[PDB]
């Protein structure tokens, strides 16, 4: 299985610090919460291995699970997105796993004994290309989809392209990044996040400019290491500026 | 009116890097969400004056408000803590403000047009003293209540006391901090966060060791400046350790 995503590293020279900054987005929910809600776990894997997944949720997500109300858990991710068939299948798997055996007693025990909390990832915006869509077009479209920043605000620098490959075990993930430079003021990217734009808030809780110091700080505190991507981008930006 | 909180600055020398670190806790919900839920706002405000409160909530908090289900909003803060009297008063204010005039249409419009998102503060644990409770006793009790770290784990350094004063206009905040040094290893304080301990999760989403670099990084990214507290604390720890 191969999953290819393409993203855009959009950068600014903040005229106040004389530092280079990039647009990053923070997720709204954890991968663990999603994996649990979509039944990507083994009920027959005994406790500690489902316990880590519960450990890697946020406290609020665990408090949502403790309600045993699958509709509220689902809303947390999908926000009344019309996916009824998927919802029905996942809901029946949830109640078969956790409600019919004991009306939620083992689930509540596991939720209560779970320790710690997960972290919401900072990421570069990216998504899967549409049907026979070119890579640059896909990166631009997904960037606008997630952040609301239109092509008006930036110029692509076409000689930068960075590819990264990860393996999860059976799915190979390839991530492709273009580079863009801000050509129009945009001081507060977070203000593009509004509940009237369903696709921006769908998986995003915050949009922010981040300098290299912030990129390193975040990278050393989350599973996703952003420094091998942002590093070469900022290097390219420096070379571009010195020309 | 003066509101006094007392807290404990618990510090550790990391034996691997030789960095001094302190216990900090991250809030579970924003102050804006709490103020809305407890009706600490004026309905007769012009639009912008509620726009700022909604703007400084998280996206998830706004999505909770958008359901118009006051019980779910309430649960987000209180987690079925039995406080029916207060709940009744706040629910009645919510129902008069947002449900009875138009069945939630203006509230939904306001939730939708709000832009951006707030930030969950990192804090030193602290709380209000009980009646005829001493300052140190309050700091110790509140620290244990929030983090689950008992007195076994640390030595009070009695000769440090730090006071801070803030003004909001008629509300005076005085914060008093004692200092403690870890006297037993504790690598993963976040594992004390479990839903079986209601007082730890009530207002906390994460517990972490933070060195001075992290303290400065966080302080320059939130309204709460921790460096005027942790700086002198770490100075005291440094003086204590070199002797």
UniProtKB/Swiss-Prot annotation, chains A, B:
Subunit structure comment from the entry: Interacts with host RPL23A.
InterPro entries linked: NUDIX_hydrolase-like_dom_sf, NUDIX_hydrolase_CS, NUDIX_hydrolase_dom, Nudix_hydrolase_domain
Keywords: Early protein, Eukaryotic host gene expression shutoff by virus, Host endoplasmic reticulum, Host gene expression shutoff by virus, Host-virus interaction, Hydrolase, Late protein, Magnesium, Manganese, Metal-binding, Multifunctional enzyme, RNA-binding
Nudix hydrolase domain boundaries: 92-234
Listed name of the protein: mRNA-decapping protein g5R
Residue positions of motif Nudix box: 127-148
Gene Ontology CC: host cell rough endoplasmic reticulum
Residues engaged in binding Mg(2+): 133, 146, 168
EC top class, as a word: hydrolase
Keyword Manganese: yes
pH dependence text: Optimum pH is 9.5.
EC number: 3.1.3.-, 3.6.1.52
Function summary: Decapping enzyme required for the removal of the 5'-end m7GpppN cap tethered to viral and host mRNAs to allow their decay in cells. May therefore accelerate viral and cellular mRNA turnover to eliminate competing host mRNAs and allow stage-specific synthesis of viral proteins. Acceleration of the turnover of cellular transcripts may even promote the shutoff of host protein synthesis. In addition to the mRNA cap, g5R also efficiently hydrolyzes diphosphoinositol polyphosphates.
Keyword Zinc-finger attributed: no
Single GO biological process annotation from the record: symbiont-mediated suppression of host gene expression
Localisation per UniProt entry: Host rough endoplasmic reticulum
GO molecular function: bis(5'-nucleosyl)-tetraphosphatase (asymmetrical) activity; diphosphoinositol-polyphosphate diphosphatase activity; metal ion binding; RNA binding
Reactions performed catalytically: diphospho-myo-inositol polyphosphate + H2O = myo-inositol polyphosphate + phosphate
Cofactor: Mg(2+); Mn(2+)
Active-site residue list: 142 (nucleophile)
Family the UniProt entry places it in: Belongs to the Nudix hydrolase family. DIPP subfamily.
Induction or repression: Expressed early and up to late in the infection cycle.
